[PDB]
Design a protein around this ligand. Sequence first.
Ligand SMILES: Cc1ccc([C@@H](c2cn(C3CCCC3)nc2-c2ccccc2C)n2cccc(N3C[C@H](C(=O)N[C@]45CC[C@H](CC4)NC5=O)N(C)C3=O)c2=O)cc1
Ligand SMILES: Cc1ccc([C@@H](c2cn(C3CCCC3)nc2-c2ccccc2C)n2cccc(N3C[C@H](C(=O)N[C@]45CC[C@H](CC4)NC5=O)N(C)C3=O)c2=O)cc1
Lengths: 201, 213
Amino acid sequence: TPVYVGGFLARYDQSPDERDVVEHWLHALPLNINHDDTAVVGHVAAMQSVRDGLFCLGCVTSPRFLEIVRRASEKSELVSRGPVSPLQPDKVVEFLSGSYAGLSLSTPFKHVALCSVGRRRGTLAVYGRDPEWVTQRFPDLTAADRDGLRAQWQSGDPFRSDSYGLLGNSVDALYIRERLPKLRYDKQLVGVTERESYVKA
Amino acid sequence: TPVYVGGFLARYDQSPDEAELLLPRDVVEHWLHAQVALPLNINHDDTAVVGHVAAMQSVRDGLFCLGCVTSPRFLEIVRRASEKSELVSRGPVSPLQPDKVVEFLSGSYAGLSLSSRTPFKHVALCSVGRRRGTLAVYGRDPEWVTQRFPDLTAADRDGLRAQWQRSGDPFRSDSYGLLGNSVDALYIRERLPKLRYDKQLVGVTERESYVKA
Ligand SMILES: Cc1ccc([C@@H](c2cn(C3CCCC3)nc2-c2ccccc2C)n2cccc(N3C[C@H](C(=O)N[C@]45CC[C@H](CC4)NC5=O)N(C)C3=O)c2=O)cc1
Ligand SMILES: Cc1ccc([C@@H](c2cn(C3CCCC3)nc2-c2ccccc2C)n2cccc(N3C[C@H](C(=O)N[C@]45CC[C@H](CC4)NC5=O)N(C)C3=O)c2=O)cc1
């Protein structure tokens, strides 16, 4: 029972302190925790460029990883408080949404990384059990674009690390400066403020 | 080898944001005159006892306490995890020497929080205290850690030292517990800002200590 995650990898809307490049850059891409090849959880399942940025849709497949997340979610207050509105409890989808709230890329496309908060602004990670559902979270998207994505989505366990790794990668995150302000930005920007979701930001 | 941790539980010069966090000097000192040794845990969780409180003392600027982290099951978990933490790797500053375990405690559990009505229930290592000034300073030597705190005076340290001259591993949890509790901390708002306020308040300039704030 895998988990999809979707978001923008790069946001044309925003000027860095760091569209042609990407569409050209196109014609098994893996997905890991925080850019650490001993921590591959699953794969990208689609990329696509649109009116406002590069958008990505990846799948989270690893039995050992998901097991940590399940166990770890059982001992989290945030998770226990559940999600909102009419959304139904999903301990695993909520704990990811909290832990790895951000997305980042490195063909020219090396891999996609789930991280606590992303390098390039506007890169909020939306988790969920259904790919259509996660695309439907982002108002800027269109159904022609979802056609681009659904076209793509419609080994063994590659996970070297363990809880301890994750435990250590987690408290690095705690010291990234003004991360919660940055994360709420990608919210009021990519519109997952509007369509309700499992996002904890 | 255990790790001591020290800091303010409450600051008299500070007005709370919640009315329920009032502890002033007259109430603290009354309780100190009141009559096991108090346990130390992670986030007020009775399953996460990592050791004990070794001393408390009312002093000019507040209530201060020194605590000891003895648990081998806990410390082991921490040891394994600092092994995989970029912050730990970057390393401490100035002339300090690397202490992976000490550094990771300083990151994960930057704060102290008292549990109080035997009116002192316990003390809690936690990622940030709701009282301000509750920065938690870790180190291998009780003295050294109290020397990290400017507001303290020899008379105050003599009272402290006189309490640390006082085996049932009490920890009942695991990495999963701490994993889940960490991503809670991620969504405490104005956390890093608040820790930094704590730093400047109590003197701990961080160029003389393992604090990571
Ligand atoms: C506000 C903020 C957010 C994030 C971070 C920052 C960070 C803070 N700490 C530390 C802080 C203390 C302990 C942890 N570690 C990191 C960190 C950096 C690199 C890899 C892993 C981690 C965890 N951070 C976090 C996650 C992912 C990041 N990147 C950079 C990479 C990147 O620049 N890749 C390039 C882009 C263009 C070109 C040249 C480089 N090609 C590429 O592949 N990228 C796009 C990312 O995924 C990243 O920069 C910093 C601040
Ligand atoms: C800026 C900020 C800092 C901390 C928190 C806040 C928090 C945010 N989240 C959530 C947020 C998302 C998931 C976790 N959980 C917590 C939380 C609370 C209690 C225990 C564990 C956790 C993790 N938080 C965290 C740790 C310790 C706190 N306490 C409790 C204690 C306390 O109030 N003890 C009292 C005082 C008077 C009376 C009734 C209670 N008698 C007592 O003994 N104390 C002195 C504190 O500092 C605490 O208030 C909130 C904001």
